[PDB]
């Protein structure tokens, strides 16, 4: 409720700024989040914090992160915005109960006389805690979120159904309700649960009705040729005896509330997009006349619908720039040679991070060639003593040794790249992208920064499955012969050892210089020069780093 | 669950283990004191007081010092034990009451634990009316009589149900093994050794380790229930018996030269208090003076 | 001098000391054929201003002023006329029916008539009806007034403390502030708590219990409320009650002179304190 | 007897306010404490859960020579079929002994961080111990509870 | 009480000697509490502070300051005032003389500026060592923070010209604050800097708060909690005030100490604050001008 | 007096029993009224809240909410402290002990301030009862009112960096001449938040709807600027009054309501009251029997009631 | 400058500009300037011989 | 401190700038806080300046 209504006060903002914008309420309910990869329990344990930026589509930059705010609460999210509870009254609006998530309002990117851009991406981030492991991103197109109107039809009998139950509560209740109460039910009545999801389900929606008065004036004249304080005001009463205060949140549960379902693009879910009257956001009743123009979703698709063009770069070159002296803002997704988003995609933003999955490993696959070229000599690097039959266990690791290159490789692989960004050789490249800038999450501690010997491990599991066996990248200072030392200071079981301290652990290290390690148990180690195959372009470096930095105050 | 056996026990079906009910009674004694001859020393001193004038005088005081010291090397003027007046608090049927404080995580799912709530806690002699503010006690309520003393607080410990009954007919250690700072042999670490670390045996009955498992090692249910570091009790002011016996600190926190032990056991202050109506634990501004060889 | 007199001559009009307790908290009325200037000022325009001037006029024909000027209030006269008005009903209502039929309603209707009349045009009753004492003697006679009912500080209760044992007339009132308990002495003040247009200019009387400070007091007194729902402004003023340098000596009675609960408070610094209103 | 020629009787409805409150449930510290001083590998057949891989058909000779190797190792956790009761309240011949503390939950040397439905062969090493939850009151072992 | 004496200087007048006769129970100010005292320390020519006579500023500035005595009985060769800032709460009963205003049963008087009221009233001067007593007024705490406030905003509407503020009705009576005929000529240039001060304080910090809190919120708990408080207020003061005016932080922050220095100086100069009680005993409760009255020590 | 005392609870360092003897006339806070009451509150070990230890901007905020206490008398059984919030009922002016760098004057206002000097720390220790001790530093309350805004716009500094390192470091003070440097180490968030929200929200409601017609005088504040002395040295060189200057806004409802005397009402109501919300409560005043004008440094100056 | 009785420049350029040109270093030169109420606040040096 | 004048000549801060400022030329030589010279046996005269 108020999450909606504490971010128009950042709404109330702005003021001249360079773009101006507007707000779009978003109810993400439960399977929208499990489906994403987001644990229900762990949000559920109203306030929260919620880092969102937003990104084009063709070409461009992206907006650095914006703190907001959530409110997650576990009930009829649609149901409770209709039927509220009361502390001493929970039973004034009995109903149907429903799913629930998070309450998050989300602001628009428009134009001066606003015409909003579709496939356009606004990215949320969710962070249970400092973690890239306690965080998911989250992908929103315009398209996805705008409908072109809301529903308040739906308001017109949710609002008397409140006056009946202001007329049910006191003929139950009787003599124990005060004297304030006993006065605005029968003022109702001189003027069944109440399900919220057929609000949703219900076929009717909002109408210009100038139209619908004519084709009624002349349907109502044919009949009569041939025959020839209101009640919201007592709605406060209402709730100012039985609350005994005002409460700016319940103050819009009595005005125009559409309830509009949409759909998501990624995981085939649903979610909500909210409006009230009084809302400066986004239907509000209550705002600045600029606000969108569905033009763009009309253009593109009726001059590729038309013309049976599927592909907009199949679209004919008359028909290209005639929609170019329509609409400017296209010469980036139809006339760049290579924009580093891909244009007129839908993953063009999840295509955007397979490339830079791809990238790594065969940056990193051609640097394991480069150190591995003929028959090593890698004598060692770390010092640990043996005893006398200890030695013959590293009798197979002579043995082991060819199958795991292969197999972490084949891991590397076999992660997804969302699953890629959590780990350390993903963040200590943009620790020096950064360097060619503070990455996000802030795994990175003070002193990584510092020297070429601020190394950061990840783990991996030796015999049995080659499995990754950490959460947290593990920043192991290390010094012929070096010994190693931890750094300063939610439990997870291999977090406690030097890399390459004993058997059954892969240890792999990386550094802002970007020359890691691969440290092996028995001190047998030795460096790499990944950046020499590190092949990543500063333009499309620019808009990677932006969209995974985070600008440190 | 918790919830299935809240419904398993009012209907009356054993739920595959059992328990031990561990309680204090209070017996008030006509002691004897033998003495010798020349044992104290107890001079005295000068007597005047002309304190603050509280309105119409001051009224006039006179207090004196004095002042006694032990004049003898060894155990002089002793003491005894020989009558039973009345057992001042009953022995009673009382049961303990978890929900009287705050301690724990409660269920996620919000339906069950408030349906659970009034459950346990309909019409319990310690069950309060109103129930938790944030800082302050739960108010145990009054009933409009009581006849016999002071009620009992008989709290519960699980146990499964295949020990002897061999034990329990010896004044044994009630977690399963034998606890105090007695047995210890000034070694510096034997004390928590004997406590927690079950590779040996019990100094009480050595032919085994424990006796109930779940009451005797680290981070078991008794051991989670009942110690002082966890203090899940701590709000509520009903004497925990248990509490003694479960402190991982206090037991270790006595001596043990032999000297001072037992003239502790002559005037120690206990936890119980005999002016209330329940074992309320011991109010910090009072004396005791109990005598406990428990 | 730790003990001392005060007199004031008044009407029975107004608390009829014989009709009260030996223990009262008594007002007085300072400014008492005030406000109907300050009716029209102090008040931004949408107020209406021509309400106050009829509304003590109405007050003092259940009370001509003579020699005998209005003055001496009770404690239960704000009490059991805001009963109706703030959070509390048929408990705060047992002090009408302690007025009723000891002192009268028709004084109470015309006032609680007031106290939606004063707080409307911000005339707010803190700074009017000035604290005076504990009611020591009432030398009264049968229709007029002559009450010695001593200020000045501790005094008041010591004089009535080695012999009235200041009773909180309410057990709604004597606020159980600082549950959070523990060992001290109590700090005693007197607020009154509004809600402008929200409950239509509420007004409150009860006395908080608190071991806090003046400056302890403030930020106490923005924290517990739930009636912040305002925007208009300058609500909950409060002065010093004075201490009770004891909290060991309070109690719970039904007891008085009408079943009424009753606090017994015995030993009192009486310090008369100063008011603020700003927010 | 009370204090009187009067009889007095103790249920187990008498156990109502004391094993009905939600810290049955609480078992925080208790995987934390015992998690240091880890566990080696204790070639864990019945401590690890097999995701499912290809048809039911032949999913036998998989697990049959998965689990060629370490199921002739040693032994599982439970052995106390052929114990009687206090031979396992005995500090020899239960080194399992420190592992069972709670009545409604289990402590044993399971798989370390692989997430469980997934993979045939667990990486055998290092150890975790966790919980699981004692479902209904007879997996109570047979030393605790008599047949 | 502590009975502290003010020695009377060489040859007077019997008229001299008279005017110390008209002032038995008056308020005196004095700088130190030495048990003998002169009347050196006690005159208006002893509160010069610059080299010039002191304004109502300056006077305030002292009234505040130095220490409050009142004559209980006028003497040949010395002045016996027991002096109130000593002693114990609501101990050692005084007497003072009334000015227009009642002085009811209660209210904790003040002392402050004569030229509020008529400026050559209460300046009693001697005639022989030409010196000159201007005792201050007792003003009640509600009508003494009035009347400071009104004159003030009396000196706005006198300095930079084009209702009337005059009026101000006590509980009973009608109180004529104009005093015309030669005096608010003078008020308006011996309240002449207090204005400023007044002024100065106002311009300066609501000029820094709209420059102050658009530069705040965004260089978070207090962010949106400024206008939680403040919503339809602030903005809304936001929307009236900045834009029929004008519109740099480390002139900015410098400003911000200078200002609320400023700031807490003139709590300690305006407000009034209460000294000694008006609580007495079997009197009628309410005092007349020129009549005498029971008065108490601490407020 | 209403006397409370505490006590000396276990043992003594035989040197620092005379520490205890020169530190008569210092203050001690003691979170209550008490007859008898521990040591172990007294010290700065109790100052420090939960992990972390306050601020000089959070000692104001500690010192907030406890009780300061004059030492009286010391015993080497008990030390008898009179408490200042309600036994200031002294003819005997109970003494106190000035511990700072500034000679004072007669009559000044004192409140207490933490110590926060370059070189007046008032570190005393004690090692058989382990506990640390920072007393106080008395000072006058004009100058104790020049500090508390400096050290808050400090860590309002401490919010956002952007401008470059050469700030002006609030860090030099002027009584009379007197260069004082203080300390600049460490500012707590919440110390300071908390402290910056009630100088926005206190500034809120000092505006009026009548403060408005104020704000068009504004240029002619400067037009008195080149043709006297008061004004031109009443108007500030490190002003925004002076950088603003490079109208009724009609609105008019009644205009029987006095616009103009309801602003300074509530304007003196927040605005005037910024001193004593943020810091602590003077009321102890400089006294001195003797005539002597000013009190040195280290003396024990006789202490009246509230000013 | 320690007074301020006299009326200053017009022009606010030369008011701010004369006015720190000579109390810039003064032994009498007033910092933290001239209070309403108050007093000039000499610089009191650390030695005087 | 050079906002402080010299004692000795209250017209102005010091005598010489290239010694008696801190971290100035004089006070970089012969301060013993440094002791650019001293493990040597002869007497530096303006050690105790």
Same mark, same amino acid.
């Given at each position: 409720?108020?999450?909606?209504?504490?971010?128009?006060?950042?709404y109330?903002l702005?003021?001249?700024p360079?773009?101006?914008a507007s707000?779009?309420?978003?109810?993400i309910?439960?399977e929208?989040?499990?489906?994403?990869?987001?644990?229900?329990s762990?949000?559920v344990?109203?306030?929260?914090?919620?880092?969102?930026?937003?990104?084009?589509?063709?070409?461009?930059?992206?907006?650095?992160?914006?703190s907001?705010?959530?409110?997650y /609460?576990?009930?009829?999210?649609?149901?409770?915005?209709?039927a509220?509870?009361?502390?001493?009254?929970?039973?004034?609006?009995?109903?149907?109960?429903?799913?629930?998530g998070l309450?998050?309002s989300?602001?628009?990117?428009?134009?001066?006389?606003?015409?909003?851009?579709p496939?356009?991406?606004?990215?949320?981030?969710?962070?249970?805690g400092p973690?890239?492991?306690?965080?998911?991103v989250?992908?929103?197109?315009?398209?996805?979120?705008?409908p072109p109107?809301?529903?308040?039809?739906?308001?017109?009998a949710?609002?008397?159904?409140?006056?009946?139950?202001?007329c049910?509560y006191?003929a139950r209740?009787?003599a124990?309700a005060?004297?304030?109460?006993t006065?605005?039910?029968?003022?109702?009545?001189?003027?069944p649960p109440?399900?919220?999801?057929?609000?949703?389900?219900?076929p009717?929606?909002?109408?210009?009705?100038?139209?619908?008065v004519?084709?009624?004036?002349?349907?109502?004249?044919?009949?009569?040729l041939?025959?020839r304080?209101?009640?919201?005001?007592?709605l406060?009463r209402?709730?100012?005896?039985?609350?005994?205060?005002?409460?700016?949140?319940?103050?819009?549960?009595?005005?125009?509330?559409?309830?509009?379902?949409?759909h998501?693009?990624?995981? &085939?879910?649903?979610?909500?997009?909210?409006?009230?009257?009084?809302?400066?956001?986004?239907?509000?009743?209550?705002?600045?006349?600029?606000?969108?123009?569905?033009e763009?979703?009309?253009a593109?698709?009726?001059?590729?619908?038309?013309?049976?063009?599927?592909?907009?770069?199949?679209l004919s070159?008359?028909?290209?720039?005639?929609?170019?002296?329509?609409?400017?803002?296209?010469?980036?997704?139809?006339?760049?040679?290579?924009?580093?988003?891909?244009?007129f995609?839908?993953?063009?933003?999840?295509?955007? /991070?397979?490339?830079?999955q791809?990238?790594?490993?065969?940056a990193?696959?051609?640097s394991?060639?480069?150190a591995?070229?003929?028959?090593?000599?890698?004598?060692?690097?770390?010092?640990?003593?043996?005893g006398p039959?200890?030695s013959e266990?590293?009798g197979?690791?002579?043995?082991?040794?060819?199958?795991?290159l292969?197999?972490?490789?084949?891991?590397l692989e076999?992660?997804?790249?969302?699953?890629?960004?959590?780990?350390?050789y993903?963040?200590?490249?943009?620790?020096?992208?950064g360097?060619?800038?503070?990455?996000?999450?802030?795994?990175?501690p003070?002193?990584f920064a510092?020297?070429?010997?601020?190394?950061?491990?990840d783990?991996?599991?030796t015999?049995?499955?080659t499995?990754?066996?950490?959460?947290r990248?593990i920043?192991?200072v290390?010094?012929?012969?070096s &010994?190693?030392?931890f750094?300063?200071?939610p439990?997870? /079981?291999?977090?406690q050892?030097?890399?390459?301290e004993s058997?059954?652990?892969?240890?792999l290290?990386?550094?802002?210089?970007?020359?890691?390690?691969?440290?092996?148990?028995?001190?047998?180690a030795?460096?790499?020069?990944?950046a020499?195959?590190?092949?990543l372009?500063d333009? /499309?470096?620019?808009?990677?780093?932006?969209?995974?930095?985070?600008?440190?105050? | 669950?918790?919830?299935?056996?809240?419904?398993?026990?009012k209907?009356?079906?054993?739920?595959?283990?059992?328990?031990?009910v561990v309680?204090?009674?209070?017996?008030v004694?006509?002691?004897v004191?033998?003495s010798?001859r020349?044992?104290?020393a107890?001079?005295?001193?000068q007597?005047?007081v002309?304190?603050?004038?509280t309105?119409?005088?001051?009224?006039?005081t006179?207090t004196?010092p004095?002042?006694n010291?032990?004049?003898?090397?060894g155990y002089?003027?002793?003491?005894?034990?020989?009558?039973?007046?009345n057992?001042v608090?009953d022995?009673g049927? !009382?049961?303990?009451?978890?929900?009287?404080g705050?301690?724990?995580?409660?269920?996620?799912?919000?339906?069950?634990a408030?349906?659970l709530?009034?459950?346990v806690?309909?019409?319990?002699?310690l069950?309060?009316a109103?129930?938790?503010?944030?800082?302050?006690?739960?108010q145990?309520?009054?009933?409009?009589?009581?006849?016999?003393?002071?009620?009992?607080?008989?709290?519960?410990?699980?146990?499964?149900?295949?020990?002897?009954?061999?034990?329990?007919?010896?004044?044994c250690?009630?977690?399963?093994?034998?606890?105090?700072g007695?047995?210890?042999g000034?070694?510096?670490g034997?004390?928590?050794?004997l406590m927690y670390?079950?590779?040996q045996?019990?100094?009480?009955?050595?032919?085994?380790a424990?006796?109930?498992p779940?009451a005797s090692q680290?981070?078991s249910?008794?051991?989670?229930?009942?110690?002082?570091?966890?203090?899940?009790?701590?709000?509520?002011?009903?004497?925990?018996?248990?509490?003694?016996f479960?402190?991982?600190?206090?037991?270790?926190?006595?001596?043990?030269?032999?000297?001072?032990?037992?003239?502790?056991?002559?005037?120690?202050?206990?936890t119980?208090?005999?002016?209330?109506?329940?074992?309320?634990?011991?109010?910090p501004?009072?004396?005791? !003076?109990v005598?406990?060889?428990c | 001098?730790?003990?001392?007199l005060?007199?004031?001559?008044?009407?029975?009009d107004?608390?009829?000391?014989?009709?009260?307790?030996?223990?009262?908290?008594?007002?007085?009325?300072?400014?008492?054929?005030?406000?109907?200037?300050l009716?029209?000022?102090?008040?931004?325009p949408?107020?209406?201003?021509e309400?106050?001037?009829?509304?003590?006029?109405?007050?003092?024909?259940?009370?001509?002023?003579?020699?005998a000027r209005?003055?001496?209030?009770?404690?239960?006269?704000?009490?059991?006329?805001?009963?109706?008005?703030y959070?509390?009903?048929?408990?705060?209502?047992?002090?009408?029916?302690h007025?009723?039929?000891?002192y009268a309603?028709?004084?109470?209707?015309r006032?609680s008539?007031?106290?939606?009349?004063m707080?409307?045009?911000?005339?707010?009753?803190?700074?009017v009806m000035?604290?005076?004492?504990?009611?020591?003697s009432?030398?009264?006679?049968?229709?007029?007034?002559?009450?010695?009912?001593?200020?000045?500080?501790p005094?008041?209760?010591?004089?009535?403390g080695?012999?009235?044992?200041?009773?909180?007339?309410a057990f709604?009132?004597?606020?159980?502030?600082?549950?959070?308990?523990?060992?001290?002495?109590?700090?005693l003040?007197?607020?009154?708590?509004?809600?402008?247009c929200?409950?239509?200019?509420?007004?409150?009387?009860?006395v908080?219990?608190?071991?806090?400070?003046p400056?302890?007091?403030?930020?106490?007194?923005?924290?517990l409320?739930?009636?912040?729902?305002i925007?208009?402004?300058?609500?909950?003023?409060?002065?010093?009650?004075?201490?009770m340098?004891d909290?060991?000596?309070?109690?719970?009675?039904?007891?008085?002179?009408?079943?009424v609960?009753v606090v017994?408070?015995?030993?009192?610094?009486?310090?008369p304190?100063?008011?603020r209103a700003?927010a | 007897?009370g204090?009187?020629?009067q009889?007095?009787?103790?249920?187990?409805?008498?156990?109502?306010?004391?094993v009905?409150?939600?810290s049955?449930?609480?078992?925080?510290?208790?995987?934390?404490?015992?998690?240091?001083?880890?566990?080696?590998?204790?070639?864990?057949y019945?401590?690890?859960?097999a995701?499912?891989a290809?048809?039911?058909?032949?999913?036998?000779?998989?697990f049959?020579?998965?689990?060629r190797?370490?199921?002739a190792?040693? =032994?599982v =956790?439970?052995v106390?079929?052929?114990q009687m009761?206090?031979?396992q309240?005995?500090?020899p011949?239960n080194?399992?002994?420190?592992l069972?503390?709670?009545?409604?939950?289990?402590?044993?040397?399971?798989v370390?961080?692989?997430?469980?439905?997934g993979?045939?062969?667990?990486?055998a090493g290092?150890?975790?111990?966790?919980?699981?939850? =004692?479902?209904?009151?007879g997996?109570?072992?047979?030393?605790?509870?008599?047949? | 009480?502590?009975?502290?004496?003010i020695?009377?200087?060489?040859?007077?007048?019997?008229?001299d000697?008279?005017?110390?006769?008209?002032?038995?129970?008056?308020?005196?100010?004095?700088?130190?509490?030495?048990?003998?005292?002169?009347?050196?320390?006690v005159?208006?020519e002893?509160?010069?502070?610059?080299?010039?006579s002191?304004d109502?500023?300056?006077l305030?500035?002292?009234?505040r300051?130095?220490?409050?005595?009142?004559?209980?009985?006028?003497?040949?060769?010395?002045?016996?005032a027991?002096?109130?800032?000593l002693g114990?709460?609501?101990?050692?009963?005084?007497?003072?003389?009334?000015?227009?205003?009642?002085?009811?049963?209660?209210?904790?008087?003040?002392?402050?500026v004569?030229?509020?009221?008529?400026g050559?009233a209460?300046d009693?001067?001697?005639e022989?060592?030409?010196?000159?007593?201007?005792?201050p007024?007792?003003?009640?705490?509600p009508? $003494?923070?009035?009347?400071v406030?009104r004159?003030?905003?009396?000196?706005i509407?006198?300095?930079?010209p084009?209702?009337d503020?005059?009026?101000?009705?006590?509980?009973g009576?009608?109180?004529?604050?104009?005093?015309?005929?030669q005096?608010? $000529?003078?008020?308006?240039?011996?309240?002449?800097?207090?204005?400023?001060?007044?002024v100065?304080?106002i311009?300066?910090?609501?000029?820094?708060?709209?420059?102050?809190?658009?530069?705040?919120?965004?260089?978070?708990?207090?962010?949106?909690?400024?206008? %939680?408080?403040?919503?339809?207020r602030?903005?809304?003061?936001?929307?009236?005030?900045?834009?029929? %005016?004008?519109?740099?932080?480390?002139?900015?922050?410098?400003?911000?100490?200078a200002?609320?220095?400023?700031?807490?100086?003139?709590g300690?100069?305006?407000?009034? $604050?209460?000294?000694?009680?008006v609580?007495?005993?079997?009197?009628a409760?309410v005092?007349?001008?020129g009549?005498?009255?029971?008065?108490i020590?601490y407020?």
């Amino acid at each position: 409720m108020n999450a909606h209504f504490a971010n128009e006060v950042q709404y109330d903002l702005t003021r001249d700024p360079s773009s101006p914008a507007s707000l779009i309420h978003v109810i993400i309910s439960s399977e929208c989040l499990a489906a994403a990869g987001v644990p229900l329990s762990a949000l559920v344990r109203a306030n929260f914090r919620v880092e969102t930026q937003t990104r084009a589509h063709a070409t461009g930059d992206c907006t650095p992160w914006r703190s907001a705010f959530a409110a997650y /609460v576990p009930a009829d999210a649609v149901g409770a915005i209709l039927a509220p509870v009361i502390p001493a009254h929970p039973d004034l609006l009995p109903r149907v109960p429903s799913a629930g998530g998070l309450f998050v309002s989300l602001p628009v990117a428009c134009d001066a006389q606003g015409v909003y851009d579709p496939y356009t991406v606004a990215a949320l981030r969710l962070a249970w805690g400092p973690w890239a492991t306690c965080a998911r991103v989250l992908l929103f197109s315009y398209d996805e979120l705008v409908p072109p109107n809301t529903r308040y039809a739906a308001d017109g009998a949710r609002l008397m159904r409140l006056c009946r139950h202001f007329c049910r509560y006191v003929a139950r209740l009787g003599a124990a309700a005060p004297a304030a109460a006993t006065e605005a039910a029968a003022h109702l009545s001189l003027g069944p649960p109440i399900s919220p999801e057929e609000q949703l389900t219900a076929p009717g929606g909002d109408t210009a009705t100038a139209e619908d008065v004519s084709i009624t004036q002349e349907n109502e004249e044919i009949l009569a040729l041939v025959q020839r304080r209101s009640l919201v005001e007592w709605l406060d009463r209402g709730w100012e005896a039985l609350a005994g205060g005002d409460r700016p949140d319940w103050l819009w549960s009595r005005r125009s509330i559409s309830v509009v379902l949409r759909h998501h693009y990624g995981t &085939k879910q649903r979610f909500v997009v909210v409006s009230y009257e009084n809302s400066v956001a986004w239907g509000g009743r209550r705002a600045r006349p600029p606000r969108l123009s569905s033009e763009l979703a009309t253009a593109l698709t009726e001059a590729c619908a038309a013309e049976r063009v599927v592909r907009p770069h199949q679209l004919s070159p008359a028909a290209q720039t005639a929609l170019l002296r329509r609409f400017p803002a296209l010469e980036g997704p139809l006339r760049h040679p290579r924009p580093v988003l891909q244009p007129f995609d839908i993953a063009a933003e999840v295509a955007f /991070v397979a490339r830079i999955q791809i990238a790594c490993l065969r940056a990193l696959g051609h640097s394991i060639r480069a150190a591995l070229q003929g028959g090593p000599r890698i004598f060692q690097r770390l010092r640990y003593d043996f005893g006398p039959h200890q030695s013959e266990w590293l009798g197979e690791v002579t043995r082991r040794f060819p199958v795991l290159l292969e197999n972490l490789m084949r891991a590397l692989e076999g992660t997804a790249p969302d699953a890629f960004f959590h780990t350390a050789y993903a963040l200590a490249v943009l620790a020096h992208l950064g360097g060619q800038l503070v990455p996000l999450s802030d795994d990175i501690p003070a002193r990584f920064a510092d020297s070429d010997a601020h190394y950061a491990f990840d783990y991996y599991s030796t015999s049995g499955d080659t499995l990754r066996l950490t959460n947290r990248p593990i920043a192991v200072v290390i010094d012929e012969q070096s &010994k190693c030392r931890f750094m300063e200071g939610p439990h997870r /079981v291999c977090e406690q050892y030097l890399p390459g301290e004993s058997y059954a652990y892969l240890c792999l290290g990386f550094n802002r210089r970007l020359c890691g390690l691969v440290v092996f148990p028995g001190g047998f180690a030795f460096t790499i020069n990944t950046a020499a195959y590190l092949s990543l372009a500063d333009p /499309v470096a620019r808009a990677v780093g932006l969209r995974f930095c985070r600008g440190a105050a | 669950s918790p919830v299935a056996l809240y419904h398993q026990l009012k209907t009356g079906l054993h739920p595959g283990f059992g328990f031990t009910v561990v309680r204090q009674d209070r017996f008030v004694t006509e002691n004897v004191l033998f003495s010798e001859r020349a044992s104290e020393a107890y001079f005295l001193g000068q007597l005047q007081v002309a304190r603050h004038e509280t309105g119409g005088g001051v009224n006039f005081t006179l207090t004196q010092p004095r002042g006694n010291v032990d004049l003898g090397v060894g155990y002089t003027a002793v003491a005894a034990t020989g009558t039973v007046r009345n057992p001042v608090t009953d022995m009673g049927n !009382l049961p303990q009451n978890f929900y009287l404080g705050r301690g724990a995580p409660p269920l996620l799912d919000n339906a069950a634990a408030v349906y659970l709530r009034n459950a346990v806690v309909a019409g319990n002699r310690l069950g309060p009316a109103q129930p938790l503010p944030v800082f302050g006690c739960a108010q145990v309520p009054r009933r409009a009589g009581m006849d016999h003393g002071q009620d009992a607080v008989c709290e519960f410990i699980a146990t499964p149900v295949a020990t002897d009954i061999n034990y329990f007919r010896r004044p044994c250690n009630p977690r399963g093994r034998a606890a105090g700072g007695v047995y210890a042999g000034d070694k510096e670490g034997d004390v928590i050794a004997l406590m927690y670390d079950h590779g040996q045996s019990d100094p009480a009955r050595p032919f085994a380790a424990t006796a109930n498992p779940w009451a005797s090692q680290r981070f078991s249910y008794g051991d989670l229930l009942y110690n002082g570091a966890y203090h899940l009790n701590g709000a509520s002011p009903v004497l925990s018996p248990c509490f003694k016996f479960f402190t991982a600190a206090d037991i270790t926190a006595k001596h043990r030269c032999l000297e001072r032990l037992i003239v502790e056991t002559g005037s120690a202050v206990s936890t119980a208090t005999a002016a209330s109506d329940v074992q309320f634990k011991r109010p910090p501004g009072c004396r005791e !003076l109990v005598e406990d060889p428990c | 001098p730790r003990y001392h007199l005060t007199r004031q001559v008044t009407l029975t009009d107004l608390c009829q000391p014989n009709a009260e307790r030996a223990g009262a908290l008594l007002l007085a009325l300072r400014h008492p054929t005030d406000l109907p200037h300050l009716a029209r000022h102090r008040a931004p325009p949408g107020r209406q201003t021509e309400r106050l001037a009829e509304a003590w006029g109405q007050l003092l024909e259940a009370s001509e002023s003579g020699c005998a000027r209005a003055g001496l209030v009770s404690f239960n006269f704000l009490v059991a006329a805001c009963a109706a008005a703030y959070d509390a009903r048929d408990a705060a209502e047992a002090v009408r029916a302690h007025i009723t039929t000891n002192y009268a309603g028709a004084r109470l209707d015309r006032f609680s008539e007031c106290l939606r009349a004063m707080v409307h045009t911000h005339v707010f009753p803190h700074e009017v009806m000035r604290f005076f004492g504990g009611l020591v003697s009432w030398v009264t006679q049968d229709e007029l007034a002559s009450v010695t009912a001593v200020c000045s500080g501790p005094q008041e209760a010591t004089h009535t403390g080695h012999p009235v044992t200041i009773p909180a007339c309410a057990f709604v009132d004597l606020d159980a502030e600082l549950c959070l308990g523990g060992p001290g002495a109590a700090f005693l003040y007197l607020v009154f708590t509004y809600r402008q247009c929200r409950d239509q200019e509420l007004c409150c009387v009860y006395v908080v219990k608190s071991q806090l400070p003046p400056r302890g007091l403030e930020a106490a007194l923005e924290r517990l409320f739930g009636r912040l729902r305002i925007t208009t402004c300058t609500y909950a003023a409060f002065a010093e009650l004075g201490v009770m340098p004891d909290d060991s000596p309070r109690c719970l009675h039904r007891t008085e002179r009408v079943g009424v609960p009753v606090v017994i408070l015995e030993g009192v610094v009486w310090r008369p304190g100063g008011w603020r209103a700003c927010a | 007897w009370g204090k009187d020629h009067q009889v007095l009787r103790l249920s187990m409805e008498n156990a109502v306010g004391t094993v009905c409150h939600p810290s049955l449930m609480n078992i925080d510290a208790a995987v934390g404490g015992v998690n240091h001083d880890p566990v080696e590998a204790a070639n864990p057949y019945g401590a690890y859960v097999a995701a499912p891989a290809g048809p039911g058909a032949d999913m036998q000779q998989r697990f049959l020579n998965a689990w060629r190797q370490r199921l002739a190792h040693g =032994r599982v =956790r439970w052995v106390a079929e052929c114990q009687m009761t206090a031979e396992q309240f005995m500090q020899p011949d239960n080194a399992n002994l420190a592992l069972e503390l709670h009545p409604a939950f289990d402590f044993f040397a399971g798989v370390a961080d692989v997430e469980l439905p997934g993979g045939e062969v667990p990486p055998a090493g290092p150890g975790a111990i966790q919980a699981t939850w =004692r479902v209904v009151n007879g997996n109570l072992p047979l030393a605790l509870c008599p047949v | 009480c502590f009975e502290a004496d003010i020695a009377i200087p060489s040859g007077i007048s019997r008229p001299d000697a008279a005017a110390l006769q008209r002032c038995e129970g008056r308020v005196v100010f004095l700088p130190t509490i030495r048990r003998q005292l002169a009347l050196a320390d006690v005159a208006h020519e002893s509160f010069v502070s610059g080299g010039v006579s002191p304004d109502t500023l300056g006077l305030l500035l002292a009234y505040r300051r130095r220490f409050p005595a009142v004559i209980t009985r006028v003497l040949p060769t010395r002045i016996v005032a027991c002096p109130v800032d000593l002693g114990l709460t609501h101990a050692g009963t005084v007497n003072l003389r009334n000015t227009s205003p009642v002085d009811l049963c209660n209210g904790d008087p003040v002392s402050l500026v004569p030229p509020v009221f008529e400026g050559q009233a209460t300046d009693v001067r001697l005639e022989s060592l030409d010196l000159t007593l201007r005792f201050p007024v007792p003003l009640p705490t509600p009508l $003494a923070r009035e009347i400071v406030a009104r004159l003030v905003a009396r000196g706005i509407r006198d300095l930079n010209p084009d209702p009337d503020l005059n009026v101000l009705y006590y509980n009973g009576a009608r109180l004529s604050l104009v005093a015309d005929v030669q005096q608010l $000529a003078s008020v308006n240039t011996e309240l002449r800097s207090l204005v400023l001060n007044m002024v100065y304080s106002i311009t300066e910090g609501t000029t820094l708060i709209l420059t102050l809190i658009p530069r705040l919120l965004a260089l978070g708990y207090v962010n949106a909690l400024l206008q %939680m408080q403040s919503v339809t207020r602030e903005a809304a003061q936001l929307i009236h005030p900045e834009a029929p %005016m004008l519109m740099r932080r480390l002139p900015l922050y410098e400003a911000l100490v200078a200002w609320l220095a400023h700031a807490g100086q003139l709590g300690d100069i305006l407000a009034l $604050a209460p000294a000694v009680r008006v609580c007495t005993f079997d009197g009628a409760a309410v005092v007349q001008s020129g009549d005498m009255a029971p008065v108490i020590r601490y407020p």
